[PDB]
Amino acid sequence: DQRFGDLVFRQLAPNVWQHTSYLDMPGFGAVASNGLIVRDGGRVLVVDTAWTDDQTAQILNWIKQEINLPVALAVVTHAHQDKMGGMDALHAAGIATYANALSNQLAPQEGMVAAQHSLTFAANGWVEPATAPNFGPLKVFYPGPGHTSDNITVGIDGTDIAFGGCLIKDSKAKSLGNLGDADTEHYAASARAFGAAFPKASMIVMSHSAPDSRAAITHTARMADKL
């Protein structure tokens, strides 16, 4: 891992980097939230934001420093502070933000800024290409009601890497995490859906755990199978 200011960066693939944002919570400590940075030719594609806009701006700094390429668009997993904490930073930079239709509807309620674009999903969970213009390797898939009712997952086409967001947990986890607005009935079903959508993905990257194997999906489903 490479320390960069208040954040940590790590390379997973020759064109896929992972960022880690830390939120200082008195009494608990530092909560880490991961994200993905993929390079597509001469453009950069970012998945999710940091805990805060400031930290998100720090990511943009790293991108401009190491990659030196402009960000085409940014896709978030859900309307939560741990993934949509840097919406203003993106808008201030002029980066097009893409989020789920439900996320943009729940964002204002959660106290977050809705994205500029709304992703529409099919009955199979797959994203509608119409609302996904020039996404490239960013394949979006909506598993269903899990961590939230607006959570989505993104797979990096051209690589065996998939992002489980805050839905999927690591194979060494003991808890599912924040189950406040989570669906205790479709959690396992949704978790398994993601695994079926991307069965070739060996590296499952999440937001609160370091990139795990496919065992993370099964583990999450097995834990959610007890709800």
Ligand X SMILES: O=c1c(O)c(-c2ccc(O)c(O)c2)oc2cc(O)cc(O)c12
Q: Where on the phi/psi map is residue 226: left (φ > 0), alpha (ψ -120 to 50), or beta?
A: alpha
Contacts to Zn ion from residues 28-87, by CB under 5 A: 80
- Tokens standing for 219? 């583990």
The residue with its CB nearest to ligand X is 82
* Distance separating alpha carbons of residues 99 and 84, to the nearest angstrom: 10
The residue with its CB nearest to Zn ion is 80
Sign, CA dihedral 88-176-167-157, equals: positive
Contacts to ligand X from residues 151-180, by CB under 6 A: 166, 178, 180
Contacts with 174 (C-beta within 8 Å, 6 or more apart), sequence order: none
Q: Pick from 157, 166, 115: which is nearest to 136 by CA? A: 157
Q: Does 166 bind Zn ion (CB under 5 A)?
A: yes
Contacts to ligand X from residues 16-45, by CB under 6 A: 28, 31
Out of ligand X, Zn ion, none, what residue 139 binds, judged by CB under 5 to 8 A for its kind, is: none
Ligand-binding annotation for 147, yes or no, is yes
- Chain positions contacting Zn ion, by CB under 5 A: 80, 166
- Residues of each annotated binding site for Zn(2+): 78, 80, 82, 147, 166, 208
- Chain positions contacting ligand X, by CB under 6 A: 28, 31, 80, 82, 166, 178, 180, 208
